[model samples]
Target chain A: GSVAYVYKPNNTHEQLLRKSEAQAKKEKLNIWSED
Target chain B: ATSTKKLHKEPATLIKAIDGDTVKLMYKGQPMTFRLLLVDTPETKHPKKGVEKYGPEASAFTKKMVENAKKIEVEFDKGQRTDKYGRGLAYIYADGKMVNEALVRQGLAKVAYVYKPNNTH
Candidate 1:
């Protein structure tokens, strides 16, 4: 999974993508490559 | 939350794929290196930092995609221009699909946690 930090507000598509990010984190992939 | 800004889109020629999420391009006949927005691919050729894990895989994937692209366009996030390295911050569209998003989908890149506003991530 990956982490995207926003210094500004997000767009509609970005918001949706953030939800999917949760799944990737749970799967513990890539950026979550360790621990 | 909103602001007064508009995305900038334009045609570009892919000079080369630097790595997974970075590329050299010819924009308006001027050469520039663009760092893909939102995604951070592993570093393949960093001087001091050196190669990272999965760096080769990501670099190969990017080369294949960019080399095979039928068309290429660049989209810049409004107000966000260049990174500290002077590389342009952009979302690369190869054959109409956003390559930044695609890289993330492929699990080849991680979402960049950029600190600056409207910049990297």
Candidate 2:
């Protein structure tokens, strides 16, 4: 079944990158550069 | 396009475009709402007033991105399947690149929002 998609944008780029990377990896992918 | 890059898969189609970052889609066999992460787009029509910086280009860019695409690959890892307003929080991906980052690369989206999870995915 299709699932709803949304965004959770945090202010700190560094923090968002760190957090998003972990999430990305957990979903079976590597942490690419986030700018 | 297949590489060791961080990838995720999602089932979706831009059923309707509500602007740049906001869209309506079919998810889980239900009509779902989406808000693009990491960037802001031109305001076509949404509750968020005071148009950001580039509203139309952002919207038009989003249209270009999802033009002939369906079955999106979402890259999000936080929140349940819905938000307070019943919206879903997800990281979008098309082809192979991250949808969130793609917007950034296209200058349609910018890092301007924040979302935190209870624990790392």
Question: How do the residues B26-114 of candidate 1 rate in per-residue lDDT, one tens digit apiece?
Answer: 88997889877766775622323343336777778888877899788887764375767878988888887777766666566666554
What is the C-alpha lDDT profile of model 2 across B1-121, one tens digit per residue?
2234433446676577666677777665767777765545444223233443355666676667676565565554433456789776566566755556655554444443444443332
Give each model a TM-score. 0.71, 0.57
True contacts kept of 2: 0.10
True contacts kept of 1: 0.18
User: What is the lDDT, from 0 to 100, of the residue B19 in candidate 1?
Assistant: 83
Off by over 4 Å in 1: A1-13, A16-33, B1-6, B44-52, B115-121
Best by TM-score: 1
Cα deviation of B26, candidate 1, in Å: 0.7
Provide the DockQ value for model 1: 0.25
Worst ten in a row by lDDT for model 1 chain A = A9-18
Whole-model lDDT values for every prediction: 0.68, 0.52
Return the TM-score for candidate 1, rounded to 2 decimals: 0.71
